[PDB]
Amino acid sequence: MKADAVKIADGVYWVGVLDWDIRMYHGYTLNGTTYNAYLVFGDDKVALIDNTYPGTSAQMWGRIKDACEKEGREFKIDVIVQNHVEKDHSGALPEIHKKFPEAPIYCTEVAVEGLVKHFPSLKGAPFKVVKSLESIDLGGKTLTFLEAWPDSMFTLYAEEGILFSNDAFGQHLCFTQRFDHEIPENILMDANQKFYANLITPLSKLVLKKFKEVILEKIKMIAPSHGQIWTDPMKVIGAYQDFATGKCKDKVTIVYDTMHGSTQKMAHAFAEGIMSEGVDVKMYFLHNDERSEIVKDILDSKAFLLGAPTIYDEPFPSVGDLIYYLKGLKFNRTGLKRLALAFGSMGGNGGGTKVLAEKLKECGFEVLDEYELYYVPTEDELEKCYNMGKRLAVKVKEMK
Amino acid sequence: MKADAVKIADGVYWVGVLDWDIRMYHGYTLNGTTYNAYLVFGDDKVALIDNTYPGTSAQMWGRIKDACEKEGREFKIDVIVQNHVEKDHSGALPEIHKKFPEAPIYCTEVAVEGLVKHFPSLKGAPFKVVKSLESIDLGGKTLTFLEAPLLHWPDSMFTLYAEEGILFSNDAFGQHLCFTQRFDHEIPENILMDANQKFYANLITPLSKLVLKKFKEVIELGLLEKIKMIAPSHGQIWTDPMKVIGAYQDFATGKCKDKVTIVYDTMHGSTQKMAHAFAEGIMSEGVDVKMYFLHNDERSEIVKDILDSKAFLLGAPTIYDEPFPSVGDLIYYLKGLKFNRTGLKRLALAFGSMGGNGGGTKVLAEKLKECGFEVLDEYELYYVPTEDELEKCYNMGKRLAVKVKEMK
Amino acid sequence: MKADAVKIADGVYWVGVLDWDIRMYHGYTLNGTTYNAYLVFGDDKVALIDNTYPGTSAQMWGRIKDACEKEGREFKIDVIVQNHVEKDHSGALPEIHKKFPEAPIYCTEVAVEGLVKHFPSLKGAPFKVVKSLESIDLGGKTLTFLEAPDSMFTLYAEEGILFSNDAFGQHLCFTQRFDHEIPENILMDANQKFYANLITPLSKLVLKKFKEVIELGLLEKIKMIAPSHGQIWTDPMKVIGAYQDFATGKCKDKVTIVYDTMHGSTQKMAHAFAEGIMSEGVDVKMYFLHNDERSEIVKDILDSKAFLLGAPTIYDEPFPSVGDLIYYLKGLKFNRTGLKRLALAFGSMGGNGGGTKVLAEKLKECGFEVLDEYELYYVPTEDELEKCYNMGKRLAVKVKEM
Amino acid sequence: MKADAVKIADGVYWVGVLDWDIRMYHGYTLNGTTYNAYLVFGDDKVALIDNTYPGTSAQMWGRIKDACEKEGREFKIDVIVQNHVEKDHSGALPEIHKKFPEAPIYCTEVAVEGLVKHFPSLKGAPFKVVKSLESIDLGGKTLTFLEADSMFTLYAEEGILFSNDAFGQHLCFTQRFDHEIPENILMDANQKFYANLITPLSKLVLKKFKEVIELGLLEKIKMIAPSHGQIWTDPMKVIGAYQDFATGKCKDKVTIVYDTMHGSTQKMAHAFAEGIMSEGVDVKMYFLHNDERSEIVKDILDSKAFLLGAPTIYDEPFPSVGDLIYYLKGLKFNRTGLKRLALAFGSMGGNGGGTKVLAEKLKECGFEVLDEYELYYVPTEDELEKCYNMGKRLAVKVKEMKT
Ligand SMILES: Cc1cc2nc3c(=O)[nH]c(=O)nc-3n(C[C@H](O)[C@H](O)[C@H](O)COP(=O)(O)O)c2cc1C
Ligand SMILES: Cc1cc2nc3c(=O)[nH]c(=O)nc-3n(C[C@H](O)[C@H](O)[C@H](O)COP(=O)(O)O)c2cc1C
Ligand SMILES: Cc1cc2nc3c(=O)[nH]c(=O)nc-3n(C[C@H](O)[C@H](O)[C@H](O)COP(=O)(O)O)c2cc1C
Ligand SMILES: Cc1cc2nc3c(=O)[nH]c(=O)nc-3n(C[C@H](O)[C@H](O)[C@H](O)COP(=O)(O)O)c2cc1C
Ligand SMILES: [Cl-]
Ligand SMILES: [Cl-]
């Protein structure tokens, strides 16, 4: 396939893949993504940093051939860099190794085992283990490896301060534009917020630790393994610092499910009370919405509301999927215990709301109240929802 | 709307609604359903047994008017019977009451409160609280009520047209089917019995012990031999009542087939490869297999197959120390359904792939135990399974299948 | 239900409904919408302009009661204004009329018939047929009607507030009521989608109605545009300007590529065409019919200078999914905007083919200028993919030349 | 992967793939399918008939190895048979050829070109072009090729016909035979397969049947082993079904398809159904907002009438109808020898026109359009009675049509 490489610095090219058609990746919705791979041309050696998903190498090979042609060099890779084991960045490693068998493969110690487990043809490949720190001179260009998850590492092109961070600072976006400044800021920052919410939230304590143990001024560009390349590294570093420390807006994310609309009516009434205080509201209906967009909004919300009816003594089963996700994400690790209210309608003994409150506490939320009612809410019951929402909104505005 | 009533007995008509277009109802998938309502013409009183979902009364009114015209009676209802509070059978009660305000509403004590909570316009309506074995004479036709608490709600009851042995069982014995055909014998048996199995699995499973109790009470009173027809609130009318009674007795007592239901989720296909390998080992023993991929399948079909499976396999990869979140939904459903209530602890295996510390499979095993399953083993592997690892899955599947065949 | 009204001017409130949960409306995808209704407090009469979708009136009543309370007035509506017949704006009319039976209902002659057909309980309601340029004095506040079929605009003369119903609306559901309170990119993209899906076939009418209003001088009197969905425009020229651009066919150096596939060959061709287009610095939007839908596709076609459509051949015809998009494009009539967007038809086949020829023919019927067709046998070779790249490159050169 | 082969006859095994997880294939919905491949052990040569979809060969290799072990033979394929070029049956051909490069590949002349186009590694492979009624001996077992790029392979001694797609069904069960699953499931899947894939070939099927009957080869068929689903131990059951579908044998049934934006067309569709039902005629109702083309055409296949409704949007019918119309234009239901009856309907709010477009497209698709009914906004009680009256008349015409 004929595909053009994109020059990002003198002798440095983006030779990645545009996955236009993917809509879902590990239960994270998207409108396509990119598998960013980079080609570094040293005076003596040519290095390929990461690659792409199995079966999507056609664009990558085309761009590698195009970059080599533009540089007046032969179609050849001398050094292979594998910052991560995950198949979206290592899927083409067996074919890259088969084509250039003498090119050493730079990766972490644990990554050798993971790579061979994914691709048995790599047994006996020339792996060059990176233990904490390792450097390679390509002739006028130096690549320094920083072992960071154990399977991962960062690659720094030292002379120009270009950090190949792999997943970190990534965003799932698929555009013809390669840089951060070429797309609308809102699209970039919202995609960055979604990527942090779904993939970095449980690592928030480490993000804070690493940042303090690195203060960063030398980083001129952040080239991640997904989406846009940051020509303004401080913009994403700053965003990460805010998310990791729990800097939120006067906003509440309301999530609910319903069978006959009573819990839905309660959710809308809570929102009215919150809005009367000028606090922002994001409303999610589990029958139509999904977990990745919900957690993106929870990330900068000072409060979270969860409602569901009772069905055979348990809350409606859809809450189970979000609860399991929140249990893995650990939002309390951002250093903030977001406020929460549990609610729902019931027709007999109830119990769904009590289960919700208990699970919200386990997920790191500060549960302030619970509100369970019988069948259809009356006007007075809806006013109670409004009053509870209003009081919560007052508390949200009072939080640091 | 012009809609014809269907005569089911002398002076008895089906005046129900065909919900052709509904595809999902309280997280239960279907290809339409019916809200079965019945009109009983006595010499003195006309009784309406149940009604329909809010906003779907047009077909119902058309059929009621057609039945009244056929019987040379005035368009009038004298008795309203509300077997259940649930809006798919009570949704038209406010408009039925507004039209005929003198007609008493027969229901249970708990039902009065539930109905008024759903429809405030019913405050002050003529409710008539009824208890088991109490009766009303319509003139040559008798309606006998039987409280069916927690079948499937506490405010539930059954109405029996005693002279013809027609049991208006509301949700019990129902099936979510929407056909032009009204009777059990008019459609393929496999479609009828599979829809009946799905309805039991999703709505009657936690009530299994209560089903066995209500049955022994109905037998001791000599009422079972008197039932000539079962007219439920959804699907087909049973002209063979023993067929569905027998099916319910089997599901409530845990009568299963030499069958395994395998459910899994995957991000990179490794857990999927494991699931396929377990299936191969099970099949080598002649045991049946039903395979569900949580990325495309849903909870109602899964539990339909669990109902007559002696074993259940659940697999998912590890994501941030937890199993893939889609399992959370199925686990929460299984926690409510309580398959142990059938009198049987189905066998189970937990499995999955991981890339670091793992832990997903341990969570799965723990949750399966909480759901009443007898967890026999756990199998967690690193990334892509090797040929040897897939043979281990096949061997584990083979051993489980041997145990399945050994169970009663 | 308790719900707060939002004051938009002195004695003027938004008493609308936030439909948080709707995800699809007449085959148009969205993340909720609003049914904007307005309450105008005159010294003598209180007027309600439009209402909401059947079954969603709880928020509306709450906001009306809240606005009445804030104004120190009784819970009373004296005048009902029905700008449009469509149920998303008239659904609560039977209950508004039942509550205030003496309040006249202001609407066009054709609207009366349309409203009674929707709601039989309105037979005998006090309808007040309005002619164009007819006014009502509420006491210090004047409402002027402009018949634009059963649809009309209401102008609150004193403050220049134009209640435009669907025109200038956007399907957005936020706590924020004004255009300036949300990111411009979100507002303008939602406005582009609304124009693409609902105003495109009316482009010639948009141009004529604008040309007259400018020479007449009405446009300079508009200080605010309060539509029936989404954000209220505090900057009316921003949306008027956007409409003028869409109506005249002002496009970007961009190509929208739409395709479907059974075995991946047409998909490979589509990606190769995109590579050739990109080599010329031209923008590309890629849509796969197995996962994507018509409302987002047409939003991108609106500002694209070219459109590519590809599908394999199945029983002498193109893959059936194209039929849906073609039927939509036939009704939207993009050719009318004043420009004929460039187009290429493509696909893979395994026997006699013919799908690509059908595609080219339908693209021509939809008003596109079809430059070429490319049909190949089964899996594309490296040379065939380079041909796609070359065709996409040449098309991109032509796009930049327009 | 370890996977067991299934013995179908002495020295004949099913070595296919169970695609448990597939839910959609070329716009045809399903709950998994199978890619049936067969291993024939002769005294001298071992033949593999068809294979599987690319990337799904693990089960296939496991079943081939298991069959060879059970036969006390070495893991070896001496003959490769390729009945079709389609990747769901030829996807593993490059790896089968790489493993056994000396094994000739039997296929049609056109098949060679198609296979090499799909898999460039096959350039120079030992292809053996086969023409009609040509045979090969495996040692006590004979394989006869029947040209249909597609073809049929007949194991002559036991009368086993490897029909490839013909007589196939998209079903994925542990059970391999027709008699081991409920008849309704089998016959409904067979009806869906005919509707979506054989309908435009109806006249050719009738020709190819009369030719197989004249030769007296039909009475020789003891088993039909297709490339998808169940193996027919009762070949006449599926042959009979095919004869009925190809000749237009239908039930007193009507398929109603509609789309709506505000529910008015939906109310009309329900009212037409009420009138049809008052005549004892069967009804299948499809809402295009939730349903899809493959199930719709399955029911059209044995319906004597078809109703299509949609509102008017910018002078055109709701766009979802365009997809079904394009599908029906390819399927050519008039090829069954019957012009099914049809009514076009819809609601509108201005000038209308959607119903006229519907009627025109239904005629193009081979339907006999009897009437059109377009109304303004919400139907009144009287308008719903008119739908009911029209449905009743159509139903009377349906009952009057004979086979
Ligand atoms: C299948 C089913 C199971 C139910 N189980 C219970 C239960 O265990 N306890 C209870 O109090 N109510 C139960 N109910 C009643 C619901 O909780 C009641 O309808 C509730 O108000 C629904 O709220 P929603 O309108 O938000 O769905 C059940 C209802 C259904 C349909
Ligand atoms: C978002 C994400 C989170 C993960 N979290 C964990 C984890 O917490 N522990 C672990 O051992 N592996 C983790 N992994 C690695 C996966 O478990 C590994 O890829 C596994 O083999 C996936 O199985 P599958 O192929 O069935 O999806 C994670 C992978 C991803 C993509
Ligand atoms: C159900 C079906 C019907 C087909 N009909 C035709 C046809 O009428 N004419 C033709 O030339 N090819 C036909 N083909 C072959 C396809 O056009 C061929 O596989 C094409 O390359 C598919 O393109 P894709 O890979 O983009 O799906 C058909 C294929 C299938 C599966
Ligand atoms: C986007 C849109 C476009 C429309 N275009 C037309 C039209 O061109 N001609 C017409 O008579 N009515 C038109 N209408 C009105 C609809 O046809 C009318 O609401 C119809 O009764 C809807 O039927 P349904 O309730 O079955 O969707 C349109 C409505 C919408 C929302
Ligand atoms: Cl490999
Ligand atoms: Cl309170």
Ligand SMILES: [Cl-]
């Ligand atoms: Cl009420």
Ligand SMILES: [Cl-]
């Ligand atoms: Cl218990």
Ligand SMILES: [Cl-]
């Ligand atoms: Cl009304």
Ligand SMILES: [Cl-]
């Ligand atoms: Cl060329």
Ligand SMILES: [Cl-]
């Ligand atoms: Cl190949």
Ligand SMILES: [Cl-]
């Ligand atoms: Cl023809």
Ligand SMILES: [Fe+3]
């Ligand atoms: Fe119920």
Ligand SMILES: [Fe+3]
């Ligand atoms: Fe095929």
Ligand SMILES: [Tb+3]
């Ligand atoms: Tb990644």
Ligand SMILES: [Tb+3]
């Ligand atoms: Tb009580």
Ligand SMILES: [Tb+3]
């Ligand atoms: Tb029910």
Ligand SMILES: [Tb+3]
């Ligand atoms: Tb509107």
Ligand SMILES: [Tb+3]
């Ligand atoms: Tb040729």
Ligand SMILES: [Tb+3]
């Ligand atoms: Tb096939």
Ligand SMILES: [Tb+3]
């Ligand atoms: Tb016109």
